[PDB]
């Protein structure tokens, strides 16, 4: 028989036996210390949720740096361009 | 002096804290919930188990008539019917072949195996909490039960321990709750003299040996047919039956949080539940002047390959300069972290090691010792045993739950797109400069 432990702990009695109480420890795959190739099956593992999340929010996060900056210096380049782009003898 | 704090409530589980009455040697203040009795205000509404069906000598008027009289007996069914001219073993025993008629009293009773087997229905209105506390303070502790119920100071001898009210009011009975040979099963139960034929508590009474009882069995009596006198009855199969049999598990089996539950009195125990918000106003007399108290000058902390886990996992050292040899107390700065130890025999000069446990994949926990404090710092291995007897002795706070280089790459990624979009403000500002510098 297989039973998914917690955290918190699981009893489990047998026959008449006294029942006996185990805790699931925080230990999984990986390495909270190894390389990320590490890192992130470890964290997966003890929580599948926070850690989907804290991926997601490292793709918004760079998606922002990406596309805002991105979109921040086409607007300076853009724009400082422009009033040389539109003089045909201007030496910029 | 007056002291508080919160206390994670783990049956046997040790907290740790260290009370620093400021001109006093920082004094070990350890609290342990040795034990818990969750006992609410039972109340008792009926007993009941397998009744018996008696059916009284039946009654025969020969010829003539019977009145179906009334009775205090529980589901009295004494109905009446003509033309029987019954048999037994001489024969008939009447002396007309008609105009007679037969009553057949009827009675449900509690059967003689009753006095044992039966079970009975409590309501809880409330599930106050009791802790067995023991508490160690300084180089002295006392064991004391405490109501959890709040302002209740439940204290004991010269230790004004107060509780507080629990994080969660949790209960494990539910409202209706039924007790059987010690075995307890939450079950609405049908409220007294609310019977039902074939459901639990078919007949019930204000105790065994009462004279009240009442029951809806639903007793029929068809008519004596057959040429012996016999007494047709027929019922649904006893309620007490029917719950024993599809009761299912006990709630010894079934409460959350590893309630234990007992009886006489009703009450669960060792359960694990919320945290307990803890007061005390320890003697002054426990104390010592800091002065006259050993002092170390020169403190560092090293780890020795901390293993965080549930148990004591982790071991670090501390080497130490002192300025006197003596008896002192050490303890965690940080609720992540706990030690298995409270106070250690000081050398002038040495180290001693320290057992701890951690929930933290590192060791970013300061540790103090009589005063001094060290921030401990290094990586803790995962513990290759994923299960262990004992409960996890410390809260898996977030907080703390990033290692540090995780904690470091995850940073320097929003680093960099905050960086990036700081970038971009500048050269919002360059552009706008720009744009009126050159005009």
Known sequence: RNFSVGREGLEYVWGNHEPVRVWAQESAPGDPHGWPHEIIIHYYHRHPVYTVIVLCGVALAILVGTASSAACIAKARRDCLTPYALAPNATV | FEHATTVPNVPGIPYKALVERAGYAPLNLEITVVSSELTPSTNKEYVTCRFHTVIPSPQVKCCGSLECKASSKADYTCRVFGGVYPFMWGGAQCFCDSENTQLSEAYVEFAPDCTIDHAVALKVHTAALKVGLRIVYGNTTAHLDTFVNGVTPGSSRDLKVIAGPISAAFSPFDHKVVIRKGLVYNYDFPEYGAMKPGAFGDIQASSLDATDIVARTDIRLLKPSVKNIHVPYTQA??????????????????????????????????????????????????????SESPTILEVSCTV??????????????????????????????????????????????????????????????????????????????????????????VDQEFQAAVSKTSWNWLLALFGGASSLIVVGLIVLVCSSMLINTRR
């Open chain 2, 237 to 290: 199969v006893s309620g007490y039956e029917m719950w024993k049999n599809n009761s299912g598990r006990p709630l010894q089996e079934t409460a959350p949080f590893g309630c234990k539950i007992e009886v006489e009195p009703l009450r669960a125990s060792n359960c694990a539940y919320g945290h307990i918000p803890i007061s005390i106003d320890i003697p002054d007399a426990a104390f010592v002047r800091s």
């Open chain 2, 304 to 393: 020795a390959d901390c293993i965080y886990s549930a148990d004591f996992g982790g071991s670090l050292t501390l080497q130490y300069k002192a300025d006197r040899e003596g008896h002192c107390p050490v303890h965690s700065h940080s609720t992540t972290a706990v030690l298995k130890e409270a106070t250690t025999h000081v050398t002038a000069v040495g180290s001693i090691t320290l057992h701890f446990s951690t929930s933290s994949p590192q060791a970013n926990f300061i540790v103090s010792l009589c005063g001094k404090k060290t921030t401990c710092n290094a990586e803790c291995k995962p513990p290759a045993d994923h299960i262990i007897g004992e409960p996890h002795k």
